[PDB]
């Protein structure tokens, strides 16, 4: 029927389509864009989060005066990133040096519906009966960055199930050609909840490197 599922490698290598699905095309992982200060995202489970060509400024704007402007104001683009850390200088990255930071994606055609399920515990949620596994990961729900603007994922979309947990899963880029990580780049993930604790005041907790992903809900992407 033409069902689609997009996969992100979170590295500079092309991810491979999951067993049972077939590749349509590869590209770069687009998380969201910000034009005239308003953010607009692309669900990571959809083909819209996978663009054939990268650019710190993948769009332009036009006005009723019939004048369009490209990379001529102060707009942003956000992309899923790789494990490459900020250079020691911590200064914005430019040009060819940006390449090592951008995640790759694959848009795959699936024979049947594809969805994600979340356990909300450290256990990997099993696929519904009649459904097979495509991949497993961590429950990624939303994010914010500049101006506290941002977007998120649909919880039954494969985009809400990232294969590798990362405190900073995306990088921020600008129309001027720079990209960098910023202190206010937040990633929101589903937390683990114990059944007898659902209607009790949450227990605050601060986590530090290492003990991070073990407090995050798990997920599995399945196909009927």
């Amino acid at each position: 029927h033409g069902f689609l599922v997009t996969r992100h490698s979170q590295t500079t290598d092309d991810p491979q389509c999951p067993p049972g699905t077939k590749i349509l095309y590869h590209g770069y992982s687009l998380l969201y864009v910000q034009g005239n200060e308003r953010a607009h995202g692309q669900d990571l489970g959809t083909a819209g989060s996978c663009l054939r060509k990268f650019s710190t400024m993948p769009f332009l704007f036009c006005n009723i005066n019939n004048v369009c402007n490209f990379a001529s104001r102060n707009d942003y683009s956000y992309w899923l990133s790789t494990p490459e850390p900020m250079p020691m200088s911590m200064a914005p990255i430019t040009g060819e040096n940006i390449r090592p930071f951008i995640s790759r994606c694959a848009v795959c055609e699936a024979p049947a519906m594809v969805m994600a399920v979340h356990s909300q515990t450290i256990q990997i949620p099993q696929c519904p009966t009649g459904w097979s596994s495509l991949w497993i990961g961590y429950s990624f729900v939303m994010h914010t960055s500049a101006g506290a603007e941002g977007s998120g994922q649909a919880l039954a979309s494969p985009g809400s199930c990232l294969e590798e947990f990362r405190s900073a899963p995306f990088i921020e880029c600008h129309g001027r050609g720079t990209c960098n990580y910023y202190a206010n780049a937040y990633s929101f993930w589903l937390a683990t909840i114990e059944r007898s604790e659902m209607f009790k005041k949450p227990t605050p907790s601060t986590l530090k490197a290492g003990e991070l992903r073990t407090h995050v809900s798990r997920c599995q992407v399945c196909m009927r």
């Binding site: 909300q120 809400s160 900073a168 206010n184 780049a185 937390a191 407090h215």
Partner: peptide, 30 residues
């Protein structure tokens, strides 16, 4: 979307999510 399965969460909580910043620091209900 109330018409999508994502709107039906198996386990409730006043705070069903947590957040992390680039410093590799995450905060839950904090």
């Amino acid at each position: 979307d109330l018409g999508l399965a994502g709107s039906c969460l198996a386990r409730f909580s006043t705070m069903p999510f947590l957040y992390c910043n680039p410093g590799d620091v995450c905060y839950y209900a904090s």
